[PDB]
Design a protein around this ligand. Structure first.
Ligand SMILES: NCc1ccc(C(F)(F)F)cc1
Ligand SMILES: NCc1ccc(C(F)(F)F)cc1
Length: 330
């Protein structure tokens, strides 16, 4: 079997992408943030503290004939940005673009942090990292991808994120019409539960390519590109007037500047991120200082190839017994 669903940016900056997901019987459609950096499927629900819900569509297990409470199970998650949520666990039928999984763990939020309440467009998250990171206690639960793997034509899913435009998540097949050239595959380490890989180097604009190993994770759930301080300083040095601002919390640049592209290596292949992808607009309404899409990972502890990088490529998440990541230009 296969599945295919359109994913849409939530705002004019591509801060995140939402994908409709059908839960329960009859279907309740929620717009979830597909996150290859986490492994919990959790949703705003009828159980969420009323004051913490602001416009989100909620899952109501009591209206689903296939929902079953998972007795005694709880979940609690904290994301690298400081967001957090927690609650209890149901099992229900979950469908993504024609692909159906029965008995999927659906984690019902009882409490959500403020950053989730204020994001009216995101009804929850669908984790696509490895199931070792799932937070359900005392019995760990499998991701949607792990549960679908056996019945998929091929144990893969692909992320084709658009720049200021809709894109596609495909499960179980690789659309050979969606990319140009060849797909370059690279080894993945699952030791931390992430889609972790090693980039072979970088270049700034039309500059010389620097061969150097950058270990990082492919994370559809992170907006920006977080890279080591040496690399990030080399990039922003090519932008007149750019500086790191402690009050803003990152590199900013004059909104009148033109940004150079950024190239990253995948084996012997190169993925080019156009400079416009790195512009995230004024730091406040009406400001002439703009926020940069490439930032330092020094405070984080790990390098993150977020949406800024991933949306420049067609990306294959190969969940075979030896997992790999594929990158192609598009
Ligand atoms: N998108 C999920 C996510 C968020 C943060 C991190 C961090 F900070 F731990 F790297 C990993 C994964
Ligand atoms: N990396 C996971 C993640 C995804 C979205 C959000 C937001 F946008 F809701 F804050 C936080 C954390």
């Amino acid at each position: 079997s296969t599945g295919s669903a359109t994913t849409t940016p939530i705002d004019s900056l591509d801060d995140a992408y939402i994908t409709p997901v059908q839960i329960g019987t009859p279907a309740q459609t929620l717009n979830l943030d597909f996150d290859t950096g986490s492994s919990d499927l959790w949703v705003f629900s009828s159980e969420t503290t009323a004051s913490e819900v602001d416009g989100q569509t909620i899952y109501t297990p009591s209206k689903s004939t296939t929902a079953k409470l998972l007795s005694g199970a709880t979940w609690s998650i904290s994301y690298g940005d400081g967001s957090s949520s927690s609650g209890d666990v149901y099992t229900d039928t979950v469908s993504v673009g024609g692909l159906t999984v029965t008995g999927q763990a659906v984690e019902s939020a009882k409490k959500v942090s403020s950053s989730f309440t204020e994001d009216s467009t995101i009804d929850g998250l669908l984790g696509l990292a490895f199931s070792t990171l799932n937070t359900v206690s005392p019995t760990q639960q499998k991701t949607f991808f792990d549960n679908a793997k056996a019945s998929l034509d091929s144990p893969v899913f692909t992320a084709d994120l658009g720049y200021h435009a809709p894109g596609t998540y495909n499960f179980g097949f690789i659309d050979t019409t969606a990319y140009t050239g060849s797909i370059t595959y690279t080894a993945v380490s699952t030791k931390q539960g992430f889609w972790e890989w090693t980039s072979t180097g970088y270049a700034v604009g039309s500059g010389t390519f620097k061969s150097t190993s950058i270990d990082g994770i492919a994370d559809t759930g992170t907006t920006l590109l977080y890279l080591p301080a040496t690399v990030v300083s080399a990039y922003w040095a090519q932008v007149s007037g750019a500086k790191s601002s402690s009050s803003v919390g990152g590199y900013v640049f004059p909104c009148s500047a033109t940004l150079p592209s950024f190239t990253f290596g995948v084996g012997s292949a190169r993925i080019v991120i156009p400079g416009d992808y790195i512009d995230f607009g004024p730091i406040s309404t009406g400001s002439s200082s703009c926020f940069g899409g490439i930032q330092s990972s020094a405070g984080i502890g790990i390098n993150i190839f977020g949406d800024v990088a991933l949306k420049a490529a067609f990306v294959v998440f190969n969940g075979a017994t030896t997992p790999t990541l594929g990158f192609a230009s598009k």
